[PDB]
Amino acid sequence: ITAVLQNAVMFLLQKDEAANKAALVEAQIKLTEKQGELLDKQIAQADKDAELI
Amino acid sequence: AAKVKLTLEQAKLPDSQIRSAGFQDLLVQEQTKVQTAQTRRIDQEILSAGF
Numbered sequence: 001i002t003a004v005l006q007n008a009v010m011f012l013l014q015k016d017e018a019a020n021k022a023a024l025v026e027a028q029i030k031l032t033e034k035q036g037e038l039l040d041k042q043i044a045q046a047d048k049d050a051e052l053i
Numbered sequence: 054a055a056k057v058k059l060t061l062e063q064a065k066l067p068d069s070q071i072r073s074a075g076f077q078d079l080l081v082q083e084q085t086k087v088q089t090a091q092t093r094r095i096d097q098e099i100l101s102a103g104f
Contacts, residue, residue, distance in 0.1 A: 052057050
């Protein structure tokens with residue numbers, strides 16, 4: 001009885017927010033994808049900018 | 054790149070063009086004006102002596 005009670009209490013508190021955390025993580029994954037693309041644009045932009053100096 | 058072209062044109066034309074044209078014009082005009090002033094001084098002195 002008591003061990004089952006303790007496990008259920010542990011379960012309810014952490015249950016819901018875990019999925020939300022995972023979705024947040026994958027959204028951050030897409031965000032990093034886009035930042036990488038922007039920096040890929042950055043290198044070529046600077047290289048073309050080279051000779052203005 | 055547009056800014057680059059601005060820089061290119063401004064460097065190529067203005068500096069050298071102004072240098073050459075201003076130097077030649079100023080030197081020639083200054084020499085001519087100095088000679089004319091000396092001649093005018095001589096003529097004024099001659100007129101004053103005659104007076």
